[PDB]
Amino acid sequence: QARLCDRTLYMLKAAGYEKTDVVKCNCAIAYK
Amino acid sequence: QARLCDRTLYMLKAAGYEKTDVVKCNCAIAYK
Amino acid sequence: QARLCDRTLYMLKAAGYEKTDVVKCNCAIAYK
């Protein structure tokens, strides 16, 4: 599914993130 | 357009970067 | 070929990594 490396996440709330933390969506990567 | 997360940028000079700072180009990501 | 930016690598053993360090494979990015 998803993978959190340091501050960057390669589900959002599952790892403590929210879509105000996503930084890119391929048509994701979240960061905080 | 572009998005700078810590040291990594997901325009270059707009955010203080130059192409000697890009690290990948999908056919970008800059880092310093 | 490959490019190591801080903790993130955009060959594995060439830069001191192993596939237990890869975090994404586009069909790579390693991290430690």
Numbering used by the authors:
A (entry chain D), B (entry chain D), C (entry chain D): 19 to 28, 60 to 76, 120 to 124
Text lifted from the article:
A perchloric-acid-soluble protein (PSP) named Tv-PSP1 was previously reported in T. vaginalis. We previously reported a perchloric-acid-soluble protein (PSP) from T. vaginalis named Tv-PSP1; this protein has a trimeric structure and may possess a putative ribonuclease function, although additional evidence suggests conflicting results due to the purification process with derivatization with chlorine. The L-PSP protein family possesses different biological functions and possible activity as a ribonuclease. The Tv-PSP1 protein from T. vaginalis is capable of binding stem-loop structures from RNAm.
We found the recombinant Tv-PSP1 structure, determined with X-ray crystallography, showed unusual thermal stability of the quaternary structure, associated with a disulfide bridge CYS76-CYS104. Each monomer of the asymmetric unit is part of one trimer formed by the same monomers from different asymmetric units. With respect to monomer folding, Tv-PSP1 maintains an antiparallel/parallel mixed beta sheet in order 123645, with two alpha helixes on one side, and the trimers form with closely packed beta sheets. We determined all structures through crystallographic studies: two of them (Tv-PSP1 A and B) have a single disulfide bond (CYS76-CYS104) with different B factors; another two (Tv-PSP1 C and D) have no evidence of any disulfide bond; and the last structure (Tv-PSP1 D) has a partial subunit due to its high vibrational motion state. Monomers C and D, with broken disulfide bridges, have high thermal stability (high average B factors) with respect to monomers A and B, which each contain a partial disulfide bridge. In the disulfide bridge, we observed a differential occupancy between A and B monomers with a tendency toward the A (75%) conformation, although the functional meaning of this is unclear. In other L-PSP1 proteins, the central area of the trimers contains a reduced cavity. These data suggest that the disulfide bridge does not function to maintain the trimer/fold protein, so may be a functional characteristic of Tv-PSP1. The structures show a potential second disulfide bridge between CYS18 and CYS101 from different monomers of the same trimer, which did not formed but are in close contact; this requires further studies to determine.
